[PDB]
Structure 1
């Protein structure tokens, strides 16, 4: 199924965009959502207005290499209170498509991604653009998790055979949880978790004041991550853990080396405590959100309490994970074991009634466990859009005509719905 060419996925991330090509098995790209323009504001000389005539008056560059551009402010059409430059996002994507990808959007088909909390106008004005600028034969803008559904059936061994269970999802501007049963869910029981990796990595920029030095204060954040991810973990008690680093050699007290990019020459710098000290925000979303702190474990409970009884056996039978932020090493094991102990504790209240009767009916327990959680989501996303099922139920151009051009001032939803 095709225009002249079949469907493909872009996952339009609010840090980096990701994509691959028809026939591959990975995102070929996971890349900076960034673009550089001079905004040094001395607006002067030879003046002119009200005339869109041929130009000598534009100075702009896009993508990862636009990060190098001087006086050019490398802005990010990621979504972060900045939202309005969905205006630039068109011209930006026109570059991406026709000039980086070097492709043809009127011949291919497409699948593209949105957050749950999206408003209409910013998309729907871009729908004239999708079908008059980009003039696509067909597309749809799915909620971002729709791509991850394919990975859950890329895993496909015996028992992969119903839509009841629970994904836990995490990321850099966003984290998510969702009470899916055969696709259905409840508003205040789906969870939209705002606490995310931005909010950590600047806190880590303050941990620099514990130990280490010699950096441009924006290569500072770069280096902080370039350490972090390979070495950081969780401890059972702080006050044990101090003394390993205090004493017990380089298996604790590692050292790292790199470059003072003030003029690109070396620094050699500490590692230690900062490893176990970094990650703890899952148990402590107060670090990002001291105004509404609630930890991983309590937040899990704050969903299950809605999810009634007969589902909780399936929840047992069928917890699930999402994103690189849920491939992590034994933080989840530590958590799981204690969160299991927490449901066990919460359950045994019931010893009130029938006394010491103390026994579970045999349930089941298993969860997702792989590095493949990173690479599958373009491949499965492109396969999804490539199902022949997709092409008519995704918005074709006339589905768009009968959704936008024919509709907003002429029964938007006939009113609200009536």
Structure 2
């Protein structure tokens, strides 16, 4: 047998490499540069025609299997990591591309949350997945994902990128280099997603709960006269060479707060753990609480893990969660690989198990016969 390849198709970035390795070999933006198109189209797009999606995935998988990885597709197996409740037609297409065009031996559709649990070694743990599109949580108890007690909110990368763009356009101060030393607002109508992502990573950080709670009430201005903490210094960011955008200190520590803002509904990235944990079985409560896992690149943002764990323990004392989750000890697990590449590492650890892989995985001979991929929906 040969070392099975691991792919993990995401909206922002795709993880690729081989099984039984310390981390992924290639990690790249999930896009393709088609002739005529100035900006490259995104390879994973939900709610489009199958033929157009088929062509994009055919183009992308080709780049992964030749330019990034150097190996024959037909020779060795595949371990496709994809999140639970991934759209039906997308997963059906992705398999149909691998089985028909590339003619792979067998694909294994592992849920990202159960794979993240294997990397630690613990059999039972709560898993939060703060991705690009949606920040999803799914309790895993001793190998069994509990779909009953699922939770998701659109407070990921996409929702954060959009919030940054909005704030920058309000307090817009750019030095074009054409008598634009004076503050010039909205010279460009929209900012490209590639720039916004680079600003987010380098400039913006996650504030402490004490400082963050003041920032929330400050921008609200709820019958108070200038009750904001002192912001960090303003950082100057180059746009397309000559144009120098002066990023305000307030924007850096306020953009993140949309994730941890209550917004009346009581629906934050913090609340989603406690909302799910309260809905879980009474016996499983204390085991899941003690074993928390924080995967996804959105949680890589500096000082996110401290704010989350703090915001949890504050929301615990709130009267809604005070009865059930009152006297619970919330402890976070530190996975071996980085927060972005926890999902991938599980699939590699699973891919190294040649004996179990072949049995669990769906063979091409079965797919060609039936034409029915197994899912958590009815058969």
Bucket of the pairwise TM-score, normalised by the shorter protein: 0.7 to 0.9
- Other-structure match for 2:62: 94
Q: Which residue of 2 aligns with 1:115?
A: 83
Distance in 1, matches of 2:196 and 2:95, equals: 40
Q: For residues 289-335 of structure 1, what are the alpha-carbon distances to aligned partners after superposition, in whole Å with 9 as ceiling and x for unaligned?
A: x9x77223443332222223322222332222212323444444344
In the TM superposition, residue 124 of structure 1 has moved relative to its aligned partner by 4.2
CA contact (8 A) 1:77 1:83 kept: no
The residue aligned with 2:73 is 105
Q: How far 1:95 sits from its partner (Å)?
A: 4.1
1:244 aligns with 2:224: no
Query: Which SS does the other structure have where 1:107 is aligned?
Result: coil
Deviation of residue 386 (structure 1)?
1.8
CA distance in 2, matches of 1:82, 1:285: 33
Matched, 1:302 2:275: yes
The answer to whether the Cα contact below 8 Å between 2:117 and 2:124 also exists between their aligned partners in 1 is: no
CA distance in 2, matches of 1:227, 1:95: 28
Does the alignment pair 1:176 with 2:176? no
CA contact (8 A) 1:20 1:29 kept: yes
Q: Structure 2: how far apart are the matches of 1:102 and 1:300?
A: 40
Instruction: Quickly say closer, same or farther: Cα 1:98–1:211, change in 2 above 3 A.
Output: closer
The whole-number CA distance in structure 2 between the counterparts of 1:285 and 1:299 is 11
Q: TM-score, normalised by structure 2?
A: 0.77
> Of 307, 311, 325, which residue of structure 1 is paired with 2:284?
311
Of 199, 211, 215 in structure 2, the residue corresponding to residue 227 of structure 1 is: 199
Change (3 A) 1:15 1:82: farther
User: 1:140: which partner in 2?
Assistant: 108
Contact 1:105 1:136 in 2 (8 A): yes
Report deviation, 1:272: 0.9
Give the distance between the partners of 2:105 and 2:371, measured in 1 at CA.
21
| Change in CA separation of 1:296 and 1:92 when aligned onto 2, cut-off 3 Å | closer
CA change 1:17–1:86 in 2 (3 A) is same
Larger radius of gyration: 1
Give the superposition deviation at 1:374: 2.9
Q: TM-score, normalised on structure 1?
A: 0.70
On the 8 A contact 1:242/1:273 being kept in 2, the answer is: no
Q: Which residue is equivalent to 2:255?
A: 278
Alignment match, 1:366: 331
The number of residue pairs the alignment matches comes to: 345
* Contact 1:255–1:271 (Cα < 8 Å) also in 2: yes
Query: Within 2, Cα distance between the matches of 1:10 and 1:27?
Result: 9
Residue of 188, 202, 215 corresponding to 2:162: 202
Asked if the contact 1:105/1:134 (under 8 Å) is kept, the reply is yes
* Structure 2 counterpart of 1:212: 173
Gaps of 5+ in 1: 38-59, 61-69, 154-159, 246-251, 351-358
Q: Does the 8 Å CA contact 1:111/1:385 hold for their aligned counterparts?
A: yes
For the residue of structure 1 that corresponds to 2:310, the secondary structure is helix
Q: Does 1:392 align with 2:358?
A: yes
Alpha-carbon RMSD: 3.4
Residue equivalent to 2:181: none
Aligned equivalents of 2:323 and 2:104: distance in 1? 58
The CA deviation string for residues 12-69 of structure 1, in whole angstroms up to 9 with x for no partner, is 11222121246642223221222233xxxxxxxxxxxxxxxxxxxxxx4xxxxxxxxx
In the superposition, relative to structure 1, how do residues 268 and 92 fare at CA in structure 2: closer, same or farther (>3 Å)? closer
More helix by share: 2
- Work out the CA distance in 1 between the residues paired with 2:293 and 2:342: 15
